[PDB]
């Protein structure tokens, strides 16, 4: 599926393998004034 | 599925393998003034 | 499923393997003034 | 410094604000066979 | 410094604000056979 | 400094604001057979 070999010295965010998914109905609110 | 081999020295956030998912109905509120 | 081999020296947050999911109906409140 | 306002429904890993740092001497071992 | 306003429904990894830094001497091992 | 307003429905990795830096001496190992 997902494979990662990572060598990092400094990182704000370090991620090897990651999945995000929505099935069905998903609603994300936006930005309003 | 998900495999990660990570070598890191400094990280704000370090994650090997991660999954986030919604099934069915998901509503996220936004930002309003 | 999820496998992680991580070597880290300093991390704000270090996570090997993690899953978060919602099934059915999920509502997250947003930010309002 | 670091400020975060996050609305999330499902996440493997959810982090608002995070710092990781090394001062001086830091050695991270790698992967060998 | 760092500011984030994030609305997300599904994420493998969700991070608002993050810093990773090394000061001085940092050595990260690599991958060898 | 860094500001982010992000609306996302599905993401493998979602990051608002992030900084990674090395000061001084940093060595990252590579990949060898």
From Swiss-Prot, chains A, B, C, D, E, F:
Cell location: Nucleus; Mitochondrion; Mitochondrion intermembrane space
Induction field: Up-regulated by hypoxia (4% oxygen) (at protein level).
Effect of residue 8 to I: In PARK22; does not affect subcellular location
Annotated function: Transcription factor. Binds to the oxygen responsive element of COX4I2 and activates its transcription under hypoxia conditions (4% oxygen), as well as normoxia conditions (20% oxygen).
Subunit structure: Interacts with RBPJ.
Disease linked to the protein: Parkinson disease 22: An autosomal dominant form of Parkinson disease, a complex neurodegenerative disorder characterized by bradykinesia, resting tremor, muscular rigidity and postural instability, as well as by a clinically significant response to treatment with levodopa. The pathology involves the loss of dopaminergic neurons in the substantia nigra and the presence of Lewy bodies (intraneuronal accumulations of aggregated proteins), in surviving neurons in various areas of the brain.
Name listed for the protein in its UniProt record: Coiled-coil-helix-coiled-coil-helix domain-containing protein 2
Protein's organism: Homo sapiens (Human)
Phylogenetic placement of the source organism: Eukaryota, Metazoa, Chordata, Craniata, Vertebrata
Gene designation: CHCHD2
